[PDB]
Design a protein around this ligand. Structure first.
Ligand SMILES: CCCCCCCCCCCCCCCCCC(=O)OC[C@H](COP(=O)([O-])OCC(O)COP(=O)([O-])OC[C@@H](COC(=O)CCCCCCCCCCCCCCCCC)OC(=O)CCCCCCCCCCCCCCCCC)OC(=O)CCCCCCCCCCCCCCCCC
Ligand code: BCL
Ligand code: BCL
Ligand code: BCL
Ligand SMILES: CC[C@H]1c2cc3[nH]c4c(c3C)C(=O)[C@H](C(=O)OC)c4c3nc(cc4[nH]c(cc(n2)[C@@H]1C)c(C(C)=O)c4C)[C@@H](C)[C@@H]3CCC(=O)OC/C=C(\C)CCC[C@H](C)CCC[C@H](C)CCCC(C)C
Ligand SMILES: CC[C@H]1c2cc3[nH]c4c(c3C)C(=O)[C@H](C(=O)OC)c4c3nc(cc4[nH]c(cc(n2)[C@@H]1C)c(C(C)=O)c4C)[C@@H](C)[C@@H]3CCC(=O)OC/C=C(\C)CCC[C@H](C)CCC[C@H](C)CCCC(C)C
Ligand SMILES: COC1=C(OC)C(=O)C(C/C=C(\C)CC/C=C(\C)CC/C=C(\C)CC/C=C(\C)CC/C=C(\C)CC/C=C(\C)CC/C=C(\C)CC/C=C(\C)CC/C=C(\C)CCC=C(C)C)=C(C)C1=O
Ligand SMILES: COC(C)(C)C/C=C/C(C)=C/C=C/C(C)=C/C=C/C(C)=C/C=C\C=C(C)\C=C\C=C(/C)CC/C=C(\C)CCC=C(C)C
Ligand SMILES: CCCCCCCCCCCC[N+](C)(C)[O-]
Ligand SMILES: CCCCCCCCCCCC[N+](C)(C)[O-]
Ligand SMILES: CCCCCCCCCCCC[N+](C)(C)[O-]
Ligand SMILES: CCCCCCCCCCCC[N+](C)(C)[O-]
Ligand SMILES: CCCCCCCCCCCC[N+](C)(C)[O-]
Ligand SMILES: [Cl-]
Ligand SMILES: [Fe+3]
Lengths: 238, 300, 281
């Protein structure tokens, strides 16, 4: 009967859809590797899909996935055991080396562009006429780290122009240079900005940007990586 | 800090948006900015695009709504105290089984149901056309229109396709708050309990799965928002530590993972399969299977 | 084996219990203390369900059903054959689910991400504990809990619902359904939008978030934005389950009559209770 034919058909369709969906989710990070970077013997039952090519806007070229995968950076880790599946210990300073929760990816060293090909993220001082419209304005507040010591002062907000939101606080340190802190890792209070992730002595080590009025995808990844790594690595001084 | 609500709002000039091949003559101007909305999402209201299809859908949609409303007022003996008291109990019912698929039923006994339904039919389909055309004008894929078609399938089956195959409009759903719940309950009893309909069971699994998946996906993107996770398109074009930590959370938890693009393929399908399997389950009820208990006993 | 990018993240630390003892992986799976707790709770639970299948005299997964104690046991222990296995399996299931949550927290800490996922999962656990622990205890017997079997638990949904007439009329049930339906609508739109931007018309450049904002303003006059839709999805789906738990915690406890009759509070308000015409008079 028709209902029997329909339910049987539906289960065959669904098995094909799951096959299609799983192969689509293998366009990054595959093939699988041994801890030494060599291709693993066992890849599982699903094959790599045929490559697709994204045409990136604003003349920034193409991306073909799957494609050749490398970290394009040195990984300061060593094995802690003689067999697979144990942790890899940092060989230096995991915050400086960018491993564990302080990891960053070698994204393009260009800033994200909006739909008109202008920089997505600008300091508010250079964004006509963006202003704080609601909530406490953090500009001028001292910044305190998890050691309850003052590390600097907020001197601007970096804004996403197309989405009209705050992405970083620009902080001025004791020595007059600035750092970006991601908005999602600070608490704005009436009389201060508080940073759980970092102690005061770790603010100077936040990676610097190379232009004062733009931030690149690579730089965002180094800054956000570094600040998140403080949750684990600044924990002796919280 | 959890990133459920913004700590600071910023505002700049109203965003009139991208042009591409859009006819700007048919865009309104920006509406006001809502500080309230701005704690959770965007403050900007408008602009909206209103071409000929937009006006047709909006007028038609209001005629469907007003047609039900005038019938509710009639039923309330034009008394605003009764209208409010009995609001959930009013019902515009379809024509009786006697009139079959005929458009000849008097207003007070199902003619008004057919008029409201006609208006609803124009409203929904013109709105479908609008989701396709607004995507075309911006050069985007038609994902939204194909996904909407899945909702339209279940609606089309309940009110149109199934009533036609059964040979009467009496089989269609009445316009009323409590009356459409009674119809839903009644439908299950008459067809020997829908829990035995395997398509109804799959629909539930996908409805469930949609809540599981958006809980997972929403939580995941907020957990990696400290590395710019919500910027999903640029993370597709150039994988960052946000996409890597998101993948590895799930790999380490349950043994497999998604890409930043691929999670949206899981998302669109989990959702469309709700109304897809649902519409099939309803289409087969009373047309092919009188009783799901009985069918289940023969597995066939 | 590892994803191409995985090794830099497999560092020591982030454990809540046992320091470095369980700080390792088995294939892709992270272990931790709460991985060991999950296996123990899950394994003991599966054995007990097998031992239940024996006493019932069936190995068919479509017939195996583990029933709570009968009502006359109230909130006491029961013999294994008559509800005791259910009681122990329920402690094992609660043990496995809480352990799974705390294991998600350990993975969060190693990866330096927020705790939103195990927070969200805790809402599923609360719905489960509502049906098997909170409602039964408030009602005064384990017997009001649902049985563990594929078809017998649907039988319980049907019998529990119809005890109160058409269960549609539970107002907390109405709100819960509204969130479930809205969440699925929102998930379809979110998936469709991102895919429509990443995968535009053949030969065109990838669209921008600005295209996604513009699409929705053109269509309905509002865009909630890329951060907003992820906030929305978390909120719709946690709300659906919150109102689900609420609709059952009030059923058989503060309200135990037909749900349809509850709506008489509205109709019998004195300023329109006695006005002729309409449906109610
Ligand atoms: C009732 C109606 C319900 C319709 C619901 C459709 C969901 C739409 C999802 C989707 O991807 O839409 C975009 C997709 C393409 O959008 P586009 O903007 O034209 O393309 C932009 C890019 O160029 C291309 O963008 P893209 O790369 O995102 O699109 C590629 C897309 C293309 O998708 C398709 O071609 C759609 C597949 C058919 C869907 C119909 C399902 C019917 C269910 C039958 C159940 C049986 C019951 C008995 O690929 C897939 O999704 C592959 C699906 C795998 C199916 C597995 C088959 C198993 C066979 C068993 C062996 O829509 C369609 O292909 C149209 C579907 C119309 C169906 C009528
Ligand atoms: C939620 C309100 C009701 C309820 C009312 C209904 C109704 C109505 C239906 C179901 C249906 C199902 N219910 Mg139920 N169900 C309830 C509580 C549960 C609980 C629990 C709280 O522990 C579980 C594990 C289940 C599990 C199930 C599945 C067998 C099935 C599809 C679920 C799904 O796709 O979800 C979404 C989740 C996913 C897509 C992720 C995958 C989850 C997998 C599929 C679960 C497998 C569970 C396994 C068989 C249990 C044994 C495993 C042990 C380790 C041995 N229900 C309560 C009592 N349930 C449907 C069915 O078809 O029943 C036959 C159906 O129509
Ligand atoms: C006593 C009641 C019966 C029962 C009888 C039915 C009947 C009858 C049906 C379902 C259907 C469903 N049931 Mg059931 N169901 C029962 C018990 C359950 C239980 C449970 C016990 O826990 C659950 C979880 C469900 C869950 C479900 C869903 C999976 C499914 C509806 C999917 C959907 O999203 O439609 C909601 C979405 C739509 C209806 C699409 C609408 C699209 C249109 C285009 C929107 C127009 C909008 C309009 C213009 C207004 C504009 C508004 C303004 C602009 C704001 N049922 C019991 C056994 N159930 C449906 C189904 O598919 O069955 C297989 C269905 O027809
Ligand atoms: C005739 C039946 C009645 C009815 C009687 C009831 C009764 C009785 C109940 C509901 C409940 C619900 N009803 Mg009702 N309901 C009816 C008709 C409907 C219709 C419809 C369209 O007609 C809809 C859409 C609904 C929808 C709903 C939801 C609001 C709710 C179920 C979701 C939930 O609680 O998730 C919560 C999720 C869970 C409980 C899952 C928890 C998962 C746990 C934490 C993890 C499991 C892990 C697993 C074992 C692992 C598997 C192994 C792995 C795969 C490896 N009902 C009709 C009128 N309804 C239920 C409710 O609100 O419960 C609180 C409920 O008890
Ligand atoms: C995958 C299935 C899910 C789904 C998907 C879905 N719905 C959709 C879409 C999609 C992909 C759209 O693109 C379309 C839309 O524009 O959404 C913003 C829509 C839509 N789904 C809507 C409603 C809706 N969807 C529902 C359900 C679902 N839609 C499923 C859960 C329901 C339920 C649960 O019953 C409702 C009530 C609208 C907001 C919109 C269709 C708008 C429309 O057709 O309007 C016509 C009428 C008017 C314009 C005037 C209305 C009268 C006055 C009140 C004003
Ligand atoms: C709160 C919103 C939604 C939600 C969220 C949610 N669920 C989650 C998560 C989140 C955020 C996870 O992180 C977690 C996960 O890992 O997802 C892949 C999970 C999860 N949600 C799951 C299931 C699930 N979620 C559901 C629902 C929902 N989860 C909500 C709709 C449902 C429904 C609707 O029924 C189910 C079935 C799992 C896939 C997973 C949790 C897995 C877990 O805890 O593993 C440890 C335990 C075992 C390996 C099994 C132990 C077995 C027992 C000891 C014995 C059996 C007892 C049981 C009572 C049998 C009853 C069976 C009968 C009823 C048929
Ligand atoms: C953008 O970001 C995102 C990602 O990546 C970029 C993601 O991946 C994901 C994740 C989502 C997906 C991959 C999509 C597919 C997911 C679903 C449809 C949800 C449903 C999932 C399942 C049914 C899988 C459930 C599997 C489980 C729980 C595994 C159980 C099996 C075992 C063998 C484990 C046994 C138990 C223990 C204790 C662990 C092992 C320990 C020892 C051996 C000891 C999301 C949400 C995301 O948003
Ligand atoms: C206060 O007063 C004012 C003026 C504001 C008016 C008030 C209005 C009010 C209070 C309105 C309330 C309306 C309500 C509560 C509506 C509820 C509707 C519900 C619950 C709908 C549920 C389901 C509907 C379905 C399934 C409809 C399906 C319809 C179709 C598929 C269309 C079928 C078309 C047909 C039969 C005609 C086709 C004809 C031709 C020629 C093609
Ligand atoms: C509820 C449906 C979701 C489950 C679908 C099954 C997907 C399993 C894929 C395993 C991938 C393993 N591997 C080696 C490729 O990483
Ligand atoms: C769902 C859309 C509307 C949501 C509006 C909710 C407003 C929340 C207000 C938060 C208060 C501001 N604060 C103190 C968190 O910065
Ligand atoms: C989802 C509800 C949001 C609706 C917002 C629509 C805003 C309309 C803008 C009105 C401005 C009209 N005009 C001609 C003065 O520019
Ligand atoms: C996107 C695909 C996700 C796969 C989810 C599959 C859930 C299985 C549901 C089993 C219910 C089967 N039943 C009894 C209704 O025939
Ligand atoms: C019926 C739904 C249950 C489906 C559960 C499947 C879980 C997939 C686990 C993937 C792990 C594969 N592995 C071990 C090769 O990595
Ligand atoms: Cl809540
Ligand atoms: Fe997303």
């Amino acid at each position: 009967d028709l209902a029997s034919l329909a339910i049987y058909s539906f289960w065959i369709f669904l098995a094909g859809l799951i096959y299609y969906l799983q192969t689509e989710n293998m366009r990054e990070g595959y093939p699988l590797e041994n801890e030494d970077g060599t291709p693993a013997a066992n890849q599982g039952p699903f094959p790599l899909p045929k490559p697709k090519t994204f045409i990136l806007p604003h003349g920034r070229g193409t991306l073909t996935v799957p494609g050749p995968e490398s970290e394009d950076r040195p990984i300061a880790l060593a094995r802690t055991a003689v067999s697979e599946g144990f942790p890899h210990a940092p060989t230096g300073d995991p915050m400086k080396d960018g491993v564990g929760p302080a990891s960053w990816v070698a994204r393009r060293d260009l800033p994200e562009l909006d739909g008109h090909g202008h920089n997505k993220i600008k300091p508010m001082k250079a964004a006509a006429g963006f202003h704080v419209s609601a909530g406490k304005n953090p500009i001028g507040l001292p910044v305190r780290g998890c050691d309850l010591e003052i590390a600097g002062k907020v001197v601007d907000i970096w804004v996403d122009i197309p989405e009209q939101m705050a992405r970083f606080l620009e902080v001025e340190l004791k020595d007059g240079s600035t750092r970006l802190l991601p908005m999602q890792m600070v608490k704005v209070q009436s009389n201060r900005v508080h940073v759980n992730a970092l102690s005061s002595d770790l603010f100077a080590g936040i990676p610097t940007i190379k232009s004062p009025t733009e931030v690149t995808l690579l730089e965002e990844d180094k800054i956000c990586g570094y600040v998140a790594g403080g949750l684990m690595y600044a924990a002796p001084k919280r | 800090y959890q990133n459920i609500f913004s700590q600071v709002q910023v505002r700049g000039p109203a965003d009139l948006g991208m042009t591409e091949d859009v006819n700007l003559a048919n865009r309104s101007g920006v509406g006001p900015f809502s500080t309230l909305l701005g704690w959770f999402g965007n403050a900007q209201l408008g602009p909206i695009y209103l071409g000929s299809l937009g006006v047709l859908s909006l007028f038609s949609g209001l005629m469907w709504f007003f047609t039900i409303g005038i019938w509710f007022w009639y039923q309330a003996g034009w008394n605003p105290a009764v209208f409010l008291r009995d609001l959930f109990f009013f019902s515009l019912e379809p024509p009786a089984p006697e009139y079959g698929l005929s458009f000849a039923a008097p207003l007070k006994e199902g003619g008004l149901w057919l008029i409201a339904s006609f208006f609803m039919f124009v409203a929904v389909w013109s709105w479908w056309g609008r989701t396709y055309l607004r995507a075309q004008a911006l050069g985007m894929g038609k994902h939204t229109a194909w996904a909407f078609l899945s909702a339209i399938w279940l609606w089309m089956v309940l009110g149109f396709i199934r009533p036609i195959l059964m040979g009467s409009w009496s089989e269609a759903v009445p316009y009323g708050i409590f009356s459409h719940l009674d119809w839903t309950n009644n439908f299950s009893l008459v067809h020997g309990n829908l829990f035995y309909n395997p398509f109804h069971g799959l629909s539930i699994a996908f409805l469930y799965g949609s809540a599981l998946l958006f809980a997972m996906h929403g939580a995941t993107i907020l957990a990696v928002s400290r590395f710019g996770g919500e910027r999903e398109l640029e993370q597709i074009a150039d994988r960052g530590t946000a996409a890597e930590r998101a993948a590895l959370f799930w790999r380490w938890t349950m043994g497999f993972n998604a890409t930043m693009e691929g999670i949206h393929r899981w998302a669109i399908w989990m959702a469309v399969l709700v109304t897809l399997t649902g519409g099939i389950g309803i289409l087969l009820s009373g047309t092919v299977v009188d009783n799901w208990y009985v069918w289940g006993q023969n597995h066939g | 084996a590892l994803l191409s990018f995985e090794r830099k993240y497999r560092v020591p630390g982030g454990t809540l219990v046992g320091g470095n003892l369980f700080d390792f992986w088995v294939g892709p799976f992270y272990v931790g203390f709460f991985g060991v707790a999950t296996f123990f709770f899950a394994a003991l639970g599966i054995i007990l369900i097998a031992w239940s299948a024996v006493l019932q005299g069936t190995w068919n997964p479509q017939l195996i059903s583990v029933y709570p104690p009968a009502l006359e046991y109230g909130l006491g222990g029961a013999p294994l054959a008559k509800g005791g296995l259910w009681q122990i399996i329920t402690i094992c299931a609660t043990g496995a689910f809480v352990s799974w949550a705390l294991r998600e927290v350990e993975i969060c800490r190693k990866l330096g991400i927020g705790y939103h996922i195990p927070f969200a999962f805790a809402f599923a656990i609360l719905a489960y504990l509502t049906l098997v622990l909170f409602r039964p205890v408030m009602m005064g017997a384990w017997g009001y809990a649902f049985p563990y079997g594929i078809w017998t638990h649907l039988d319980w949904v049907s019998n529990t619902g119809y005890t109160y007439g058409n269960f549609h009329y539970n107002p907390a049930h109405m709100i819960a359904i509204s969130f479930f339906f809205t969440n699925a609508l929102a998930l379809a739109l979110h998936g469709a939008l991102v895919l429509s931007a990443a995968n535009p018309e053949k030969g065109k450049e990838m669209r921008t978030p600005d295209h996604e904002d513009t699409f929705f303003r053109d269509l309905v006059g509002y865009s909630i934005g890329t951060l907003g839709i992820h906030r929305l999805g978390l909120l719709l789906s946690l709300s659906a389950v919150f109102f689900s738990a609420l609709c059952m915690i009030i059923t058989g406890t503060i309200w135990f009559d037909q749900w349809v009759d509850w709506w008489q509070w509205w109709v019998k308000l004195p300023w329109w209770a006695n006005i002729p015409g309409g449906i109610n008079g």
